[PDB]
Amino acid sequence: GRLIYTAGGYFRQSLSYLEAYNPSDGTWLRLADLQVPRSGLAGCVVGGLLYAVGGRNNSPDGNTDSSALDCYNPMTNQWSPCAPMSVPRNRIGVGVIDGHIYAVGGSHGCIHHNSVERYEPERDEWHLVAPMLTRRIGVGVAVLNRLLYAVGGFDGTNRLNSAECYYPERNEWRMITAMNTIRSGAGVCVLHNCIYAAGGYDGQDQLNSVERYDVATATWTFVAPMKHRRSALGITVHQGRIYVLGGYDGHTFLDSVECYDPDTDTWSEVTRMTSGRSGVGVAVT
Amino acid sequence: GDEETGE
């Protein structure tokens, strides 16, 4: 029985919450708080351990961009610090290949990163890899066919509909087919050999539209839209279904959790988080 | 403080 973990987020200020949802019984578990509050972070799992990567601590009295990597062990209910990244990365994108964490783009003050780094848990080390062709903050990251895709985001001037792909063996990036919609702060995941891009911000409105990339045809196709428009939403895949958590709709910090069934092409509200928030880190273990 | 994140 795997759980959907939600770490950090934002409501008035950056949060420390670590909560886990059980889709089987609909229950929420209140787990050990993050040591440092963060929003704009990303979550991932390697060998049953949860990782909270980058982000920013937004407090009423000041902001602190994060280069931190923290590891949560569900068996001990304890957070442990890891080696930090080379640079702080707020609005980061994260992906896992062969038990290695890829930290993609994000921001540090005025800097919009195109840089990409990789973490080796067995050595507790980060190393820079080939940078992206585009500077991307609020980037969605997905792993498919042992390739790392970086989708949408913001380059510092414009919000992007463009997407690119990383080849770990060759250590190089190549541009792929651009999405139908400009999306920054969208939820990006992989389900049944397809990349999904849900919600985000186009420059004028928070989106409820969802589009899917098919590798064989190299095309992006719209699927059923979500019930709620949302930007800076958390996203994950659990037992063949997509789960979207919170985000900002332009008025409210959502507590809404929607579930997408690819067999019926339908979204349904499954639960509510304990409180509304945006910019959470999400993973399943 | 922005439309994308609500910060």
A70 touches A81 (CB < 8 A): yes
| Strand ranges for A8-84 from DSSP E | 10-11, 13-14, 18-22, 27-30, 42-46, 49-53, 56-59, 62-65, 69-73, 78-81
Helix, strand, coil shares of chain A, percent, nearest 5, are 0, 55, 45
A111 vs A154: CA distance, rounded Å: 12
Pairing of strands A49-53, A69-73: antiparallel
A218 vs A45: CA distance, rounded Å: 28
A48 vs A74: CA distance, rounded Å: 8
**Residue showing tokens 């929607």:** A258
A238 vs A219: CA distance, rounded Å: 25
> Which domain CATH number covers A43?
2.120.10.80
> What angle is formed at CA B2 by the lines to CA A20 and CA A10, rounded to 5 degrees?
20
Q: Which amino acid is at A218?
A: A
DSSP designation for A156? S
The CA-atom distances, in angstroms, between A78 and each of A107, A124, A158, A198, A270 are 28, 18, 40, 32, 28
A191 touches A242 (CB < 8 A): yes
**Interchain contact, B5 vs A10, CB within 8 Å:** yes
**Residue showing tokens 């910090």:** A253
Resolution limit, Å: 2.2
A41 touches A54 (CB < 8 A): yes
**Interchain contact, A278 vs B5, CB within 8 Å:** yes
> What angle is formed at CA A12 by the lines to CA A7 and CA A17, rounded to 5 degrees?
20
**Interchain contact, A10 vs B6, CB within 8 Å:** yes
Six token digits for residue A212: 């899917």
For residue A232, what are the contacts with CB-CB under 8 A and spacing of at least 6?
A: A10, A39, A40, A138, A185, A247, A248, A278, A279, B4, B5, B6
For residue A240, what are the contacts with CB-CB under 8 A and spacing of at least 6?
A: A191, A192, A262
A186 touches B6 (CB < 8 A): no
- What is the distance in angstroms between the Cα of B6 and the nearest Cα belonging to chain A? 6
A132 vs A112: CA distance, rounded Å: 12
Q: How far is CA A204 from the centre of its chain?
A: 22
State how many domains chain A has: 1
A148 touches A136 (CB < 8 A): no
Query: Which residues of chain A are within 8 Å of residue B7 when distances are taken between CB atoms?
Result: 10, 39-40, 58, 278-279
Query: Which residues of chain B are within 8 Å of residue A281 when distances are taken between CB atoms?
Result: none
For residue A269, what are the contacts with CB-CB under 8 A and spacing of at least 6?
A: A227, A256, A257, A258, A259
Helix, strand, coil shares of chain B, percent, nearest 5, are 0, 0, 100
A150 touches A137 (CB < 8 A): no
Structural domain of A282: 1-285
| CA-wise closest residue to A63 among B5, B7, B2 | B7
Q: Which amino acid is at A52?
A: A
A205 vs A228: CA distance, rounded Å: 12
Q: Is A267 part of the contact surface with chain B (CB cutoff 8 Å)? A: no
A219 touches A197 (CB < 8 A): no
A19 vs A123: CA distance, rounded Å: 28
Solving technique: X-ray
For residue A265, what are the contacts with CB-CB under 8 A and spacing of at least 6?
A: A223, A224
> What angle is formed at CA A281 by the lines to CA A56 and CA A22, rounded to 5 degrees?
150
Q: Which amino acid is at A13?
A: Q
Q: How far is CA B2 from the centre of its chain?
A: 3
- What is the distance in angstroms between the Cα of B3 and the nearest Cα belonging to chain A? 6
